[PDB]
Symmetry: C2
Subunit: 131 residues, 2 copies
Amino acid sequence: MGLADDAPLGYLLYRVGAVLRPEVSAALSPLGLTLPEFVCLRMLSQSPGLSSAELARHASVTPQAMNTVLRKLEDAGAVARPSLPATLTARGRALAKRAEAVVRAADARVLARLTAPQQREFKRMLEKLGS
Amino acid sequence: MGLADDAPLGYLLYRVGAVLRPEVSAALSPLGLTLPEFVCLRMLSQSPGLSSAELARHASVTPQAMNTVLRKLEDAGAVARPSLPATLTARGRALAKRAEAVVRAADARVLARLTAPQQREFKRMLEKLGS
């Protein structure tokens, strides 16, 4: 998409994305999670028993990449031992919630680059463009 | 990423993305191009002779998906007949430029949902968040 539209709106959106993604990744790192691992974890907390293929389609990734993500999550004891169905362990559910919290905090950290009135204005304009 | 950060900034950014992507796709359709086809076309106009694997890595897509994109572009006479190196034909170079033009126009159409002063303000705030 950043490759697709290099005109100003698409480019500027892309650049904010390229700030937000590392912010989120950096926030997840101390929890032992990559961004794709977190996405998988969150999907499974919201939909227990989804298969790897299902997860891979919802994340728009390859079944192989999702299998890898799932293996690393099993290794961390977050995903239960088993394209197979997958579920979270107690540790996994706890981790999913802690991780969602640090991601929301990352989001706020990027937004806080703007003053409070600027944040309200900016969100209204984003909302308009996205509605 | 939209799956990753559902807090307000990431969510609102995602929604604007989900307006921009169909706008760009719809603009490309009369030219017989999908968005991934356009991305490939543009990459090859800027870097003749890149291999399919190279293109696939730069587009963050699978080699197989890029091979498909390349096949469809060959079919349209835009990419010359051959993980192999690929080049644009005269028709391909012409198409790449026409397509870039319609994508820039799509971008402007989404931005114009805001008033001119709002557009200036919005771009400054995007710039700040992305800097």
